[PDB]
């Protein structure tokens, strides 16, 4: 039967420990999420408690971290979502996303709206990738992908 | 001389105006955009208040909207950006992009920094864009590239 | 082509005078909602600036109300949503329904995850209605349904 | 004699421990409320820190749980209500549902004037529920319904 | 029919208007509530924006204030309540209340819980006054008499 | 020699402690102030944080609730005050009293000034009470009396 | 009879207007409150919203500053006190005095419940000056002084 | 050499410890400061964590309250100011300075600049302190005394 | 006499009148400042509202945007400081220098008390530039350099 | 294998313990940094969790201030940066660098725009240092040189 929190502090807390015990072993997010069949951002999304785990993938990721059993159970269970802690980021890379909602937030709306109609771009059926890339000029760049369901907005 | 503006709502008040125009008109971004040799995405954020058209593009899309001349200088002033009007979006399409961020903003910071390194992913030496892509289950995506240069953080 | 706003003032101005409108004619919502085709829940919204209305149902209301053509077209447009003042309601008879979810919010965030899964109930395919009822043990009760697609989240 | 609670942290902590108690026996909602007489919907208001249970169904919910009796005493305390954690929801599952009330805040109350008049539908005088049904367009719905006495407001 | 607003700036602008019509007139809230039948706090109340004037007492009103017949209408419109600027009152007179608040507001609760039981004291089944009475110790005493019905919270 | 405290937590702390004392020994505020000299406001205040008891008070509590020697002492010193977590309750039956604000605030400014003039009433040269009534009309009714010095302010 | 205001912004745009005035008669302050009887912070602060002028002080400034009939008024009603825009001031100069109870304020409750009692100092029988001292080590000095009355909490 | 803080909560919670043995020691902060040759007001501000004591100073009250060589090296470190939890005090003895603020912020501003000019009141050379003073109509009075260094904001 | 504003309004609506001059006009500030005597920065800052020029320099830029009157006096006048919006900038360019305090803030606390000692940089015996160079490694930098006087914190 | 975190505390309690024993050990920030090869403003904010030390330099400066295994890896990781408890500073030193935004913000908007372009001064490609300078009329001044890289908004 599958079960969900009600407080994030208590998967932030496992993402803390979890952290901690990645830095141990020196591993890497791709280490973690090979072997899961599922996207690196997803199982680490899961890890830093914003996605739940299928009970499979928490065993392997478990087992690679040297996790305890209510942890393991615990990555699976649906979380409270949230992972800025007061509304807006402090963190200069995070912050970055945040800036381009504050830049083009109402272009996206009305170019969404142009494009698809009255409605939202969905943030369930909904999936990102993170790519780099290299810059012709010199350096690399991100590429990444928000992918999105269109869900209309009509009368009734 | 290149001119900036401190106070947005100057620039918001002319968006407002030209979407009323723009309306009356029955005209989309696109064929705004359309002949200026300037991407949908930066046309668009420059009429709602959030980039500078240089001069011809200014005089182009003004002649569109049927703009006075007073509007057209201001479409060329550098903004007072911002777009949101009190930190987080009320608009549910605008505020599922926020809502990417409350959920995959720690992953994309993980991420970053194990792709790249230290630093941030930059939105300035940015772009992004907006494509509807057909759902091979039925209905519509929107795929939405955001595009940055990594700076680095280094110690010195 | 579809028109959208990205400053919610300027359809909340037209609100404010369709109410005046209203009530200088002493109409209900129902009646002016009455021969659109479309429910009194989603007309009353967007003449209060939170949906748009299609234009012959626009072209109906406005000439019961007697706006003039540029109100008829702003209440075309796709309208930037968000209508509490500053977040929480300070309106009692609108501070209930925040009531009912500092109460039930957990609760209904776990029976949605017990019974349907992880994800969201939507409120975008999404409607509401309100029906009267009498109290058995006197007076009257009101009977709001909320009504939204459950969409899931799944692992990629 | 009735007993009280001022600080809602006591009851939220033990909300978490029910739950991985609850996790751990792969428990849900519906059998825990099951025996108690009362609605899944007020005895997981109870166990999240919403609502007291009276004597019997602490007890019998405790059994269920392998809860304490100093648990078990905390679930008949009233509590200090509120379960958002900063105002507004960070969760998307949680947050649509303060989504709703800003797209229709403003609806809700303009209908309830017109059907009932001035005052108020009770959070108090008050009951909901969270029923599944099938979508006959496909997949599944829910259907939330709010069933508050209207309170008048009246001239004195 | 009932009518009712949605921005409480209306109404408080014609607070505004109304209190320099009072002014210039040098009258009483007394003598202005007096004739209608009413009770001081409730005209006073609805003069203030926060709560409606039957016609009747709206024609009465208005003729002492000299009010044109779109203020005399919308003395009788349902407000959007909520008299304080920001959440809390930065005028001395009104943030005493709010500090009695900060002071009693837990006792307030256990006490009503002791008396009555869950649930609470209603805001809406409610009136108040304010008496003066002589201090003994020399000076005098406002006694605001607070008195509302008690709602139970009751299990379902 | 009085001493006093500079974090509120220290005495909430405390009160979550008395609490739990309170409902293992099935006590009421009532009894537990009964012997005191003392209203049950006032020690009850006491207890929640929000007032210091004399000691001779301070030891008849202490030994009801069989509270610690540093409880006891903790119980005199002057308190730093403040109940509301946030400065908005979260909860219904303490948000009532915060709504009467929102709704009366500026009347009971306006009628304290036209019947003692400009100044306030007292939040410290006060007191209140809670008295249990029936309901003419059926149920029950509190009656909450606050009763503060006015105080003038008059020019220098 | 005294008259009152609810909205600060009406006695703020009255003291725009005052400066304005004042600015052009090139005068001071201390000329303003000249023949008035009245000390220069307290008629400073009725200029500037926060007090109200008895009628022979109101009109003796009004002819000083040629305000007109309804202005003159205005300074007669009991203000919506609360000189800050937004609760902190961003004025440098403002802005000192909050921090002197940033880094002292924890002090002053200290010292004044030794010295004095449990308990305040009271902001309304109250007076506050302001003087111009030279510092003996180069330059001058302000010596602000604040004298308001001990009232005492104690039990009932 | 100096050493410094940057989270004020470290000496915080020494302050409270400091607090607890000085109530069970029954001492006042007037005889704790004797015989450090410091001001009573600069030395209970070092105790409650906005000033830095010197050593000879933080050996003399460290012997007095018995305090531990991490506490009395603790004390001789430059605090991270801000005694205020959030910004606004809860507690009415401090929030009546607040309230000063509130009422007589812009006129300490308009009285700095005419008797001074453009700048500030510093808030660092600086110093203040807490007199009684009978009242002469019964009673008591606090004289708070502010004393600061005019800067001048000049031109460059 | 020295004349001072209370509300930023009328300083921010003159700046934009300013720009919206100088951009007709095709000036730059270093233009604009030329001749004046005083450093770019400063007299930038008094057009945008956060400093006061002397007459003369206001005079001559009032010349050179074609001013009136009522202008021309009014950037004389002492401002009421504080160019954010909301106390955090969302302007990219601005928003940088705020996160710079975010990142580095603690660190200058910690160096300024290590290399002057306990107190503060002034941010009124004060200068600023911004110089534009050269990179080593290819295209430009910004070179702000931050000149305020020392002002110490010692005992009293 | 770069690691990062995402939770502040963990490092800001680290930064906690790192001052408690610089303390005892009585060291300077430049003593510590000297030999790493790195400056003392990046070491320093390394240490106060704004910035990751390479290997070398956290081994280098655990031993000097005899931090454990997990302590020195901690040092390592790259921080969730953000050292402003709650925005805008309390303490005194930190707040006066805020002022200088609030007063100079717009103004390095506007020279950055007229000196460089549309676009930013970075706060990644950037350095600070802080300089102890004699004042000539007395005293000392420090200068911190803000050294950000030019990014260039534009067109695509
Ligand atoms: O994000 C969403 O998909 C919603 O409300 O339907
Ligand atoms: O929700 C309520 O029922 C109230 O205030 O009466
Ligand atoms: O509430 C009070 O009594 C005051 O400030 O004087
Ligand atoms: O308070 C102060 O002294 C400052 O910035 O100079
Ligand atoms: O976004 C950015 O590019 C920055 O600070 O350098």
Redesign the interface.
């Known amino acids: 039967?599958?079960?969900?929190?009600?407080?994030?502090n208590?998967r932030?807390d496992l993402?803390?420990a979890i952290?901690?015990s990645?830095?141990?072993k020196?591993?890497?997010?791709?280490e973690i999420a090979d072997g899961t069949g599922?996207?690196?951002?997803?199982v680490?999304?899961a890890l830093?408690g914003?996605?739940?785990?299928?009970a499979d993938?928490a065993r392997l990721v478990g087992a690679k971290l040297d996790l305890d059993e209510?942890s393991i159970?615990?990555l699976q269970?649906?979380?409270?979502?949230?992972?800025?802690?007061?509304?807006?980021?402090?963190?200069?890379?995070?912050?970055?996303?945040?800036?381009?909602?504050?830049?083009?937030?109402?272009?996206?709306?009305?170019?969404?709206?142009?494009?698809?109609?009255?409605?939202?771009?969905?943030?369930?059926?909904?999936?990102?990738d993170?790519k780099?890339?290299a810059?012709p000029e010199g350096?690399?760049?991100?590429?990444?992908?928000?992918?999105?369901?269109?869900?209309?907005?009509k009368?009734?």
Chains 1, 2, 3, 4, 5, 6, 7, 8, 9, 10 share one sequence.
């Open positions: 039967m599958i079960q969900s929190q009600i407080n994030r208590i932030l993402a803390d952290l901690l990645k830095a141990k020196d591993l890497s997010f791709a599922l996207a690196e951002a997803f680490t999304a830093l914003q996605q739940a785990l299928p993938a209510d159970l615990l269970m649906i979380p409270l979502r949230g992972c800025i802690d007061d509304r807006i980021p402090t963190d200069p890379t995070m912050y970055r996303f945040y800036e381009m909602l504050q830049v083009y937030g109402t272009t996206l709306k009305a170019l969404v709206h142009e494009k698809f109609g009255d409605g939202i771009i969905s943030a369930i059926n909904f999936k990102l993170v780099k890339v810059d350096g690399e760049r991100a590429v990444i992908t928000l992918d999105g369901k269109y869900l209309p907005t009368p009734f």
